[PDB]
Paper text:
The only discernible differences between the wild type TKD and ΔL747-E749 are a shortening of strand β3 (from its C-terminal end) and loss of the first turn of helix αC. These changes result from deletion of the three residues (L747, R748, and E749: orange in Fig. 3d) from the beginning of the β3/αC loop. The predicted salt bridge between E762 in αC and K745 in strand β3, required to stabilize ATP interactions of the latter in the active TKD, is precisely maintained in ΔL747-E749. The ΔL747-E749 TKD structure also shows that a 3-residue deletion from the β3/αC loop can be tolerated without major disruption. Interestingly, parallel HDX-MS analysis of the less active ΔL747-E749 TKD variant showed that it does not show the enhanced exchange seen for other exon 19 deletion variants. Our ΔL747-E749 crystal structure shows how such a 3-residue deletion can be tolerated without major disruption (consistent with HDX-MS studies of this variant showing a rigid wild type-like ATP-binding site).
Tyrosine kinase inhibitors (TKIs) are used to treat non-small cell lung cancers (NSCLC) driven by [name] ([name]) mutations in the tyrosine kinase domain (TKD). The most common exon 19 mutation, which accounts for ~33% of [name] mutations in NSCLC, causes a 5-residue deletion (ΔE746-A750) from the loop connecting the third β-strand of the [name] TKD (β3) to the key regulatory αC helix. Here, we describe biochemical and structural studies of [name] exon 19 variants seen in NSCLC, with a focus on their TKI sensitivities. Determining the first crystal structure of an exon 19-mutated [name] TKD and analyzing structural dynamics using hydrogen–deuterium exchange mass spectrometry (HDX-MS) further suggested explanations for the different ATP-binding characteristics of exon 19 variants.
Numbering used by the authors: 698 to 746, 750 to 859, 876 to 997, 999 to 1009
């Protein structure tokens, strides 16, 4: 099954860095726009610049993975730039990572959005399953927010988050798709608790025997036993007894019809989050998921 992904090399005269969005280990990442020349099109992008000409290797590997996927709930690569420090041009996710998003707005997300995020993340995970790719670091941090109604997974297939890993990944370093549903169970617990740290007071070493013997995360207050039951089903030690992503899409999109039936958030009906208005820094030709 040939890979056949298309790796686009981009001209840096085609994109402009607007503001810095981060800096540190991996490198400085910029919010910017890409103008495919002769196309009369401006694309809001994120440009990940390598820390130094030595840290390139980590970038080109990331470019290999991102180019090899295509799903509405997986992050999209547009191209790379082979400068002195190579540049990684990815779709701009203006609202950041879902972890920071649920913490900042905790008092304005209703049940419709929580359950819709679970079904969307499960969709992307089901896609990475169909492609036989294992994420190995599924967390609330590695889920980026395009709009409050559209989220996409990121940082897939590249490699310690001990509190997110399944037991076979702990003791035996075994990473499969059923080890990913365990991480999926933790992230749902992350969202249902509005960005809480799993096993807050516990050190990393004690976790293995805590799970091996039989303890798990507690029940989120807003969570009914229905949504909490599938969270614990994700945390079985027997990977084959854990549910499948295909089933998690089904179960969640079901609760996504009567959301007040499965998540008790006081004031749920009064809550809401913004819509994609024409906010920018001028820009009358903007797109992103519509450029093909």
């Amino acid at each position: 099954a040939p890979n056949q992904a298309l790796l686009r090399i981009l001209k840096e005269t085609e994109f402009k860095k607007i503001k810095v969005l981060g800096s540190g280990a991996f490198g400085t990442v910029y919010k910017g726009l890409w103008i495919p020349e002769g196309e009369k099109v401006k694309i809001p992008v994120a440009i990940k610049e390598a820390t130094s000409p030595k840290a390139n290797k980590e970038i080109l590997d990331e470019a290999y993975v991102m180019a090899s996927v295509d799903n509405p709930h997986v992050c999209r690569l547009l191209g790379i730039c082979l400068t002195s420090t190579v540049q990684l041009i990815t779709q701009l996710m203006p609202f950041g990572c879902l972890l920071d998003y649920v913490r900042e707005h905790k008092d304005n997300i209703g049940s419709q959005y929580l359950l819709n995020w679970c079904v969307q993340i499960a969709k992307g995970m089901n896609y990475l399953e169909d492609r036989r790719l294992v994420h190995r670091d599924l967390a609330a941090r590695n889920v980026l927010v395009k709009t409050p109604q559209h989220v996409k997974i990121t940082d897939f297939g590249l490699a310690v988050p001990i509190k997110w890993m399944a037991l076979e990944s702990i003791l035996h370093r075994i990473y499969t798709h059923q080890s990913d549903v365990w991480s999926y169970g933790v992230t749902v617990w992350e969202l249902m608790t509005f960005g809480s740290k799993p096993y807050d007071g516990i050190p990393a070493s004690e976790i293995s025997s805590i799970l091996e013997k039989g303890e798990r995360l507690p029940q989120p207050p807003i969570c009914t036993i229905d949504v909490y039951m599938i969270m614990v089903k994700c945390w079985m030690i027997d990977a084959d007894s854990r549910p499948k992503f295909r089933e998690l899409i089904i179960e969640f999109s079901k609760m996504a019809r009567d959301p007040q039936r499965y998540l008790v958030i006081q004031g749920d009906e009064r809550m809401h989050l913004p819509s994609p208005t024409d906010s920018n820094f001028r820009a009358l030709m903007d797109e992103e998921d519509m450029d093909d």
